[PDB]
Amino acid sequence: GQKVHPNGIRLGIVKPWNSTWFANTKEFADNLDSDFKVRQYLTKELAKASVSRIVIERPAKSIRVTIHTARPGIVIGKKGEDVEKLRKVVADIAGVPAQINIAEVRKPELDAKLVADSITSQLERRVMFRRAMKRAVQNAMRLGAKGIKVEVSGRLGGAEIARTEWYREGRVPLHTLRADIDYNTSEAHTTYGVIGVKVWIFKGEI
């Protein structure tokens, strides 16, 4: 393993942070644990809701929690029923009054995380891996995405020897720091073991 995380290396240049609260050493660890506790609950609760990411901030003694999702309709349910349930539980976990925002993501097939969840979901359904990746690559290039690039790994097709067999189309300049590279990973839990999935998506150079 000799490749840097394309998100972390960009974390200051182009890629924004995923938590934007401030704290001193006294409560830094407590805030960090609360964030992790909140994130894993939401992602588990909204498994069927296709959540891209969760952004948590704590401006002036509060928690905002913004959920980027591709299907806000069922995230919010009818009016505000279910979202209120999430807000109530979140406030309980964090121990402070909580609000919640929903951000619709256009082009769900252009989001690195969502693409990975789709592939791993198909893969757990026993779709042949080669066609699942090819479909993801082609229908992403169809909508901009100068550089889609996907990679599965580990016990493919119920074999006995693991292998990767990645594909790419377009250009993916991982060595240019200002390239808007959206990268994320996911893993399937098939009966033969764990299969890992990584997807890189390239966009404008700045």
Binding site: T20, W21, F22, E57, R58, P59, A60
Partner: peptide, 8 residues
């Protein structure tokens, strides 16, 4: 007049 997004 906070307008604070992670500033103390």
């Amino acid at each position: 007049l906070d307008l604070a997004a992670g500033v103390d």
